[PDB]
RNA sequence: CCGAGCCUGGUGAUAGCUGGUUGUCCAAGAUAGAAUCUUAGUUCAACUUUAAAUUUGCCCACAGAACCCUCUAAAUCCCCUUGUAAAUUUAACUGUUAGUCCAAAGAGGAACAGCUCUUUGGACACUAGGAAAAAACCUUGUAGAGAGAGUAAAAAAUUUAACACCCAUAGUAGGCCUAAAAGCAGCCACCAAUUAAGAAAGCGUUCAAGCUCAACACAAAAAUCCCAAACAUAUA
RNA sequence: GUACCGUGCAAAGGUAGCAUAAUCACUUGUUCCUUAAAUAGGGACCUGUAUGAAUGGCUCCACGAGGGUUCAGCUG
RNA sequence: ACCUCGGAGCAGAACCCAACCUCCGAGCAGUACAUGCUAAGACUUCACCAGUCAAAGCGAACCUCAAUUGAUCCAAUAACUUGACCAACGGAACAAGUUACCCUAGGGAUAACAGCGCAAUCCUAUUCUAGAGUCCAUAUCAACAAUAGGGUUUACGACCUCGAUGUUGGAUCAGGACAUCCCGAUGGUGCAGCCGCUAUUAAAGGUUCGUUUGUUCAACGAUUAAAGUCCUACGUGAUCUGAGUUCAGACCGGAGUAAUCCAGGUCGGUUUCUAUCUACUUUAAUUCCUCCCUGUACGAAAGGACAAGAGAAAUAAGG
């Protein structure tokens, strides 16, 4: 079964309790299904978002057209639609209590991996397609080998070491220096700056 | 949306809309079909209901409507109700919701819906709107008290646009909006087919009921492997042209189109427009009909009067070669009405003589003269010919310089060489 | 279609943290749950409040807990455990500061 | 929520190159802060306007002299983003009590414990 | 001037509602909530004011404050020192209990709203400077005169898409398949020779024929009329 | 069950008449006449489960500064 | 729909925290009859009321449960004690509708018009290269999606205005945008020609008259080169009209016992203002058609052009 398996719309056992919005499951770097397994290229979410039943089956459709089933498997490093998003009837105004449960979608944090890829296959047989899922998904992302990733995260290691300006917003943020803590958050402290809501500025040190 | 359908069949007894041709169980059948195709929802309850006045507002009687009231309101699970009455009237949905609680479709909305839902095309989200325009007690369920006094009352001595004039200038509005698109669109199909038009393409189109095997026998026909035949209903949403090649070497477009259904208003379906002009412009047309059915007359009878509402041209509406498909279902099959090809889509069994029926029908219909004409060599006419006509055979004389080739070639064809090549 | 929930806090928590003179009597935690446990020189409530059965100073400690035999649900959980294992629990003591009383000359017969 | 900051030790651990920076030795600490209010406290928390009443740097731009201890630290290290803090220095020593009244505080954070107003 | 006349009187009816509430000057002064036919109000709390008694008030070192739950935040409570001068209690009261934005953690909405609702903090409902004008952002506040001085915050930066050239024989038109389908309609094999070439990576052919590739060689657009003027180079 | 053949219930199951009505909505109902063209008007309908008989129903002579439509003429 | 009480999240760690926010529950039951009497000290649902825990002592033996309830007065009782799904649950001892016949006090603290925020809805443009298009993504489109822009709709918010911002349609006059309907220039085409389609540029000028309908619109009739989409308080009522439109009258159908009512129909129904201030009051034209080109180019036919030239007009402006 190297082609990609099907997503489902929602849970065979459809959620009954409405849950909050927390947005905090987009925000920030990624802590889950940040490094390669079985597999050697995928698609990097450089930015937070939630992911539809639309967006898996754009991945799916595409991913299985442009593969090559004999050469190249590939492998979901997402969940399954499964944090339920509420919307209200069209025109209502405002309480009433929570609207009922509309769709399902799957959070994702900056830093993950949305699908793997792997194989007899290089780098460049499979990023075309790979780029082209990662430019209409709905987070900035991009098509990454083991390679690349490895590369990036050396870089960006190798600018934080050489940076010549004497001061860095881990090093201010958290000597709360100028008070700047009043205009910061608590997870400013550990996102150094290089988060904005659900954004992941990569050229940020 | 996950939904939970209560599927109500009016079983008319007596009177105009007993169907003597099928039966209440087949008609249940075609409706769970038609509700599974949508990939949404299924029949959670099924109700068969009998009724004498179908024409009337409520459709059953009194008590039969209360009954079904009661049971509907009773069990909850239901999200909305199937009725399988073809078109509902306005006032007949109005007061179906308004008693039951839940949204009411007919035959015609659930199609509306089965080609929005799957078929995500343009046409069909404006037929969707333009069906979905009568709008009125937004809250189902429940019966709601207003009190619309005192709203944009008089200021000095006159009130601006009041409600039930807003609401009817929008509504015609938007209805000449989605009437203009519509048309833009319309438009837009007609010059697609420009082109192959003036080639001049022999164009079939292929007509039936759903599932008969028009995709499947088109597919037989072409060769062509891309062509993806389902057992769903309406599987063969849009229309599509495929090429193929008849046994007199001729290139025939066949028009795979949206299989039709029973008690279903085709022409009022802005997604089988396509469908409809398409074969209206068909120089021959493919009546498929899968005998196996037990349903087979019944079909027949609503694809030809939807074919004969269509108007079409009584040349076209003659030679409309016939093939039973699925034969191979039916275990010894014998066409007893003649002039119908009994064909297997699936087994390729008679579809060779069907090339040969279909071909003769176009070499009828398009005015093609087959012919043996005398060539020049190197004069370029016979490059001409293969390109411009088809080429049955070619003799060439080698003493004289010339070829006999016998070809079937069309009138502009045949005018264009004899000024081109005097 | 959700009724309810709109009941206030119950103010429960720690009345007396480590280091606090305490009187006899004195409530020194109100708590729903057995978060801590009653030490030396304090007693229990009906409704799991911990009050102290000295005048002292109260501490906090960190001790194994060893349920009564009778502690059905305990016994079944200490009987569970794998062997090696200790349980510990929170336990508030009333160090008492003065002595019970002294010896005082009343009459030189 | 936007709460009090708790500053992580590592901050207050000066290295080598800090003490070259500003010249100050480890060892042999000095004694005394001169500290002024650079900052206002307005659209500040009401806890560093207290600190600020606490340590007296109520007026900006005015010096004081507070302990070099470590609950003066502490208060310090809440209010450090508002506060000039330099050590105090003394040329010529504690002043006494003969010279107690020719003292001046200059730029520089010497004490000096002589003032002539006159060219050297 | 009749949903029930007019006049007089009770009558200065009552109004939680609107409006008004008149000398000078100084000072303190914007604080959680509960109940209520109650959310346009009031009483009690809280805050605030005054006077008086007394002694601790604030900041805060260790140590200490739970499992459930596998992980699980900024913090908080408590708290000697220390820097500070306030705090508690007694007595007498009013007024505020219809609130805005900003930063942060959240909830509802549509991860809309100058939207709504909680929490921590700030500012505003007070002065001044700045962000163009400017309640809420930044700087800064304790007050007077000065035709002195050092400063605080405080002025946006960006201009971005060229590209190879040459050359191609081949066992054969690889087989089957088909009317022929010959690298190039479909499936299987997919080698191999020439110095160098995939039984061909793309066009084209009715099928061929003919042309190429790998291989040899060599960002944005709206409705009265754009909107300071301008300036790239004289030493922070 | 296939209009009439049986049955339930009710006090009786809306009868005659008229009918897109000044008669909930659907509504610009569907037709014919009328106009070059009519959501108007008039005549009709298996036309009202929200018509209907002294809460009066239909027809009709006269009459009306009542409300519609209209021939011809007339005219700013 | 809810109104009182309790548990869990929001509210991760002392306490406390809203919501017509998310979820669960309660208005008991069981056992005991010392489930007796007293009494330090404490907790406390942010007040009070109320509610909690409890050392020691007497007298004895040797309560479970999260909520599981309700004050005062007043009744019943000899007393002890008991009494409200007083659930609008801090509880008037006992009182419903309707109002357009309406009235007063206020409120822009609060809705309808308009503006404003926003952009769900609506509209527009790109990216994606699946799929339509005989072949062929890109002549014209286009699913799943992505990124932007606009502020024409319906909303949502309730920020100015309720000691009045008069609000549908029409007349009159129009100012403006271009996202161009016609006229101009231009690229592509599945552009043979004629018609077209699509895109760039262009807002100087123009963009019809009628039948029904209050219609804006829609349909239809006849035209036109075309009969554009919008903004302007859905421009413009101190310039006009009031046909529609939930003031007072009345009828029909329906609801109700009735008053009366129905975003149902229908017949009728008062349009004020002498201008103080601002502003303003005389600022090289377009288009169609006729002939001819010409039955020519083009085309198999059907049909059928440009450009050049000549002549006629129509409108607009000025006389
Ligand atoms: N036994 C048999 N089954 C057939 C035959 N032809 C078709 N079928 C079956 O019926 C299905 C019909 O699918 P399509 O041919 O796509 O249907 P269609 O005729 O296009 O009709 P729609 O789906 O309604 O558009 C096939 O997928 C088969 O399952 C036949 O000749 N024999
Ligand atoms: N505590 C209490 N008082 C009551 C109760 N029932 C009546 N009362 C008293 O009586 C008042 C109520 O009067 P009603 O409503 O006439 O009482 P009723 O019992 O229904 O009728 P009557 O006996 O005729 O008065 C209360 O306010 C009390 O004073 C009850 O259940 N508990
Ligand atoms: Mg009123
Ligand atoms: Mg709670
Ligand atoms: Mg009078
Ligand atoms: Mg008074
Ligand atoms: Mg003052
Ligand atoms: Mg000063
Ligand atoms: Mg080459
Ligand atoms: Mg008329
Ligand atoms: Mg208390
Ligand atoms: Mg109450
Ligand atoms: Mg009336
Ligand atoms: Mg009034
Ligand atoms: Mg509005
Ligand atoms: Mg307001
Ligand atoms: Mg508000
Ligand atoms: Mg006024
Ligand atoms: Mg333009
Ligand atoms: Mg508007
Ligand atoms: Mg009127
Ligand atoms: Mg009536
Ligand atoms: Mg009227
Ligand atoms: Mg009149
Ligand atoms: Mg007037
Ligand atoms: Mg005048």
Same mark, same amino acid.
């Given at each position: 079964?190297?082609?990609?398996?099907?997503?489902?719309?929602?849970?065979?056992?459809?959620?009954?309790?409405?849950?909050?919005?927390?947005?905090?499951?987009?925000?920030?770097?990624?802590?889950?299904?940040?490094?390669?397994?079985?597999?050697?290229?995928?698609?990097?979410?450089?930015?937070?978002?939630?992911?539809?039943?639309?967006?898996?089956?754009?991945?799916?459709?595409?991913?299985?057209?442009?593969?090559?089933?004999?050469?190249?498997?590939?492998?979901?490093?997402?969940?399954?639609?499964?944090?339920?998003?509420?919307?209200?009837?069209?025109?209502?105004?405002?309480?009433?209590?929570?609207?009922?449960?509309?769709?399902?979608?799957?959070?994702?944090?900056?830093?993950?991996?949305?699908?793997?890829?792997?194989?007899?296959?290089?780098?460049?047989?499979?990023?075309?397609?790979?780029?082209?899922?990662?430019?209409?998904?709905?987070?900035?992302?991009?098509?990454?080998?083991?390679?690349?990733?490895?590369?990036?995260?050396?870089?960006?290691?190798?600018?934080?070491?050489?940076?010549?300006?004497?001061?860095?917003?881990?090093?201010?943020?958290?000597?709360?220096?100028?008070?700047?803590?009043?205009?910061?958050?608590?997870?400013?402290?550990?996102?150094?700056?290089?988060?904005?809501?659900?954004?992941?500025?990569?050229?940020?040190? | 949306?996950?939904?939970?359908?209560?599927?109500?069949?009016?079983?008319?007894?007596?009177?105009?809309?007993?169907?003597?041709?099928?039966?209440?169980?087949?008609?249940?059948?075609?409706?769970?079909?038609?509700?599974?195709?949508?990939?949404?929802?299924?029949?959670?309850?099924?109700?068969?209901?009998?009724?004498?006045?179908?024409?009337?507002?409520?459709?059953?009687?009194?008590?039969?409507?209360?009954?079904?009231?009661?049971?509907?309101?009773?069990?909850?699970?239901?999200?909305?109700?199937?009725?399988?009455?073809?078109?509902?009237?306005?006032?007949?949905?109005?007061?179906?919701?308004?008693?039951?609680?839940?949204?009411?479709?007919?035959?015609?909305?659930?199609?509306?819906?089965?080609?929005?839902?799957?078929?995500?095309?343009?046409?069909?989200?404006?037929?969707?709107?333009?069906?979905?325009?009568?709008?009125?007690?937004?809250?189902?369920?429940?019966?709601?008290?207003?009190?619309?006094?005192?709203?944009?009352?008089?200021?000095?001595?006159?009130?601006?646009?009041?409600?039930?004039?807003?609401?009817?200038?929008?509504?015609?509005?938007?209805?000449?909006?989605?009437?203009?698109?519509?048309?833009?669109?319309?438009?837009?199909?007609?010059?697609?087919?420009?082109?192959?038009?003036?080639?001049?393409?022999?164009?079939?189109?292929?007509?039936?009921?759903?599932?008969?095997?028009?995709?499947?026998?088109?597919?037989?026909?072409?060769?062509?492997?891309?062509?993806?035949?389902?057992?769903?209903?309406?599987?063969?949403?849009?229309?599509?042209?495929?090429?193929?090649?008849?046994?007199?070497?001729? %290139? !025939?477009?066949? #028009? @795979?189109? /949206?299989?039709?259904?029973?008690?279903?208003?085709?022409?009022? &379906?802005? $997604?089988? +427009? *396509?469908?409809?002009?398409?074969?209206?412009?068909?120089?021959?047309?493919?009546?498929?009909?899968?005998?196996?059915?037990?349903?087979?007359?019944?079909?027949?009878?609503?694809?030809?009067?939807?074919?004969?509402?269509?108007?079409?041209?009584?040349?076209?509406?003659?030679?409309?070669?016939?093939?039973?498909?699925?034969?191979?279902?039916?275990?010894?099959?014998?066409?007893?009405?003649?002039?119908?090809?009994?064909?297997?889509?699936?087994?390729?069994?008679?579809?060779?003589?069907?090339?040969?029926?279909?071909?003769?029908?176009?070499?009828?219909?398009?005015?093609?003269?087959?012919?043996?004409?005398?060539?020049?060599?190197?004069?370029?006419?016979?490059?001409?010919?293969?390109?411009?006509? %088809? !080429?049955?055979? #070619? @003799?060439? /004389?080698?003493?004289?310089?010339?070829?006999?080739?016998?070809? &079937?070639? $069309?009138? +502009? *064809?045949?005018?264009?060489?004899?000024?081109?090549?005097? | 279609?959700?009724?309810?929930?709109?009941?206030?806090?119950?103010?429960?928590?720690?009345?007396?943290?480590?280091?606090?003179?305490?009187?006899?009597?004195?409530?020194?935690?109100?708590?729903?749950?057995?978060?801590?446990?009653?030490?030396?020189?304090?007693?229990?409530?009906?409704?799991?409040?911990?009050?102290?059965?000295?005048?002292?100073?109260?501490?906090?400690?960190?001790?194994?807990?060893?349920?009564?035999?009778?502690?059905?649900?305990?016994?079944?959980?200490?009987?569970?455990?794998?062997?090696?294992?200790?349980?510990?629990?929170?336990?508030?003591?009333?160090?008492?500061?003065?002595?019970?009383?002294?010896?005082?000359?009343?009459?030189?017969? | 929520?936007?709460?009090?900051?708790?500053?992580?030790?590592?901050?207050?651990?000066?290295?080598?190159?800090?003490?070259?920076?500003?010249?100050?030795?480890?060892?042999?600490?000095?004694?005394?802060?001169?500290?002024?209010?650079?900052?206002?406290?307005?659209?500040?928390?009401?806890?560093?306007?207290?600190?600020?009443?606490?340590?007296?740097?109520?007026?900006?731009?005015?010096?004081?002299?507070?302990?070099?201890?470590?609950?003066?630290?502490?208060?310090?290290?809440?209010?450090?983003?508002?506060?000039?803090?330099?050590?105090?220095?003394?040329?010529?020593?504690?002043?006494?009590?003969?010279?107690?009244?020719?003292?001046?505080?200059?730029?520089?954070?010497?004490?000096?414990?002589?003032?002539?107003?006159?060219?050297?």
């Amino acid at each position: 079964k190297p082609k990609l398996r099907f997503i489902e719309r929602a849970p065979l056992v459809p959620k009954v309790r409405r849950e909050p919005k927390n947005l905090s499951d987009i925000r920030g770097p990624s802590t889950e299904a940040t490094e390669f397994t079985e597999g050697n290229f995928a698609i990097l979410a450089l930015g937070g978002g939630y992911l539809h039943w639309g967006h898996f089956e754009m991945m799916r459709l595409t991913i299985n057209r442009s593969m090559d089933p004999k050469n190249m498997f590939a492998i979901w490093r997402v969940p399954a639609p499964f944090k339920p998003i509420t919307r209200k009837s069209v025109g209502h105004r405002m309480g009433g209590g929570k609207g009922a449960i509309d769709h399902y979608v799957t959070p994702v944090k900056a830093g993950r991996l949305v699908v793997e890829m792997g194989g007899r296959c290089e780098f460049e047989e499979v990023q075309g397609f790979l780029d082209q899922v990662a430019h209409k998904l709905p987070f900035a992302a991009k098509a990454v080998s083991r390679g690349t990733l490895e590369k990036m995260r050396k870089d960006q290691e190798e600018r934080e070491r050489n940076n010549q300006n004497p001061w860095t917003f881990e090093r201010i943020a958290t000597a709360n220096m100028l008070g700047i803590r009043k205009v910061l958050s608590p997870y400013d402290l550990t996102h150094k700056g290089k988060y904005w809501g659900k954004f992941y500025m990569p050229k940020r040190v | 949306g996950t939904q939970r359908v209560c599927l109500v069949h009016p079983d008319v007894k007596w009177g105009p809309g007993k169907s003597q041709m099928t039966r209440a169980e087949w008609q249940v059948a075609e409706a769970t079909a038609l509700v599974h195709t949508l990939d949404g929802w299924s029949v959670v309850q099924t109700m068969v209901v009998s009724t004498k006045t179908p024409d009337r507002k409520l459709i059953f009687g009194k008590g039969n409507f209360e009954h079904l009231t009661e049971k509907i309101r009773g069990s909850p699970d239901i999200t909305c109700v199937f009725l399988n009455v073809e078109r509902m009237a306005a006032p007949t949905k109005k007061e179906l919701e308004a008693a039951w609680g839940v949204e009411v479709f007919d035959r015609f909305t659930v199609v509306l819906h089965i080609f929005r839902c799957n078929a995500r095309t343009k046409e069909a989200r404006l037929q969707v709107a333009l069906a979905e325009m009568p709008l009125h007690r937004s809250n189902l369920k429940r019966d709601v008290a207003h009190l619309y006094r005192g709203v944009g009352s008089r200021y000095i001595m006159g009130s601006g646009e009041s409600f039930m004039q807003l609401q009817q200038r929008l509504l015609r509005e938007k209805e000449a909006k989605i009437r203009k698109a519509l048309d833009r669109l319309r438009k837009k199909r007609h010059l697609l087919r420009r082109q192959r038009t003036r080639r001049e393409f022999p164009v079939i189109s292929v007509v039936g009921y759903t599932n008969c095997g028009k995709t499947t026998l088109i597919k037989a026909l072409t060769g062509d492997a891309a062509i993806q035949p389902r057992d769903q209903l309406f599987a063969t949403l849009d229309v599509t042209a495929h090429a193929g090649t008849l046994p007199s070497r001729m %290139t !025939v477009l066949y #028009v @795979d189109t /949206i299989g039709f259904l029973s008690q279903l208003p085709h022409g009022l &379906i802005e $997604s089988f +427009s *396509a469908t409809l002009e398409d074969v209206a412009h068909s120089d021959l047309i493919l009546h498929v009909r899968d005998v196996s059915h037990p349903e087979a007359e019944l079909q027949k009878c609503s694809v030809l009067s939807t074919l004969r509402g269509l108007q079409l041209p009584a040349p076209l509406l003659d030679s409309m070669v016939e093939v039973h498909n699925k034969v191979d279902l039916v275990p010894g099959y014998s066409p007893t009405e003649p002039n119908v090809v009994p064909v297997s889509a699936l087994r390729g069994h008679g579809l060779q003589e069907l090339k040969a029926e279909l071909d003769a029908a176009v070499l009828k219909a398009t005015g093609r003269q087959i012919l043996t004409l005398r060539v020049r060599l190197a004069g370029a006419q016979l490059s001409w010919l293969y390109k411009e006509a %088809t !080429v049955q055979e #070619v @003799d060439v /004389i080698p003493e004289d310089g010339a070829a006999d080739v016998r070809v &079937i070639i $069309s009138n +502009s *064809a045949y005018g264009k060489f004899r000024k081109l090549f005097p | 279609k959700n009724l309810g929930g709109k009941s206030s806090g119950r103010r429960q928590g720690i009345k007396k943290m480590e280091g606090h003179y305490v009187h006899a009597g004195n409530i020194i935690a109100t708590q729903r749950h057995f978060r801590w446990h009653p030490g030396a020189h304090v007693g229990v409530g009906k409704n799991k409040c911990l009050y102290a059965l000295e005048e002292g100073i109260v501490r906090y400690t960190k001790e194994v807990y060893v349920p009564h035999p009778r502690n059905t649900e305990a016994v079944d959980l200490i009987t569970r455990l794998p062997k090696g294992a200790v349980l510990y629990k929170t336990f508030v003591h009333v160090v008492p500061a003065k002595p019970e009383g002294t010896f005082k000359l009343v009459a030189m017969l | 929520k936007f709460t009090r900051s708790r500053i992580p030790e590592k901050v207050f651990q000066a290295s080598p190159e800090d003490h070259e920076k500003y010249g100050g030795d480890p060892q042999n600490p000095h004694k005394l802060h001169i500290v002024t209010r650079i900052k206002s406290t307005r659209r500040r928390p009401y806890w560093e306007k207290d600190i600020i009443k606490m340590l007296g740097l109520e007026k900006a731009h005015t010096p004081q002299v507070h302990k070099n201890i470590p609950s003066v630290n502490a208060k310090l290290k809440v209010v450090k983003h508002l506060i000039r803090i330099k050590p105090l220095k003394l040329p010529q020593g504690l002043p006494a009590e003969e010279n107690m009244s020719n003292t001046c505080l200059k730029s520089t954070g010497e004490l000096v414990v002589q003032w002539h107003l006159k060219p050297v």
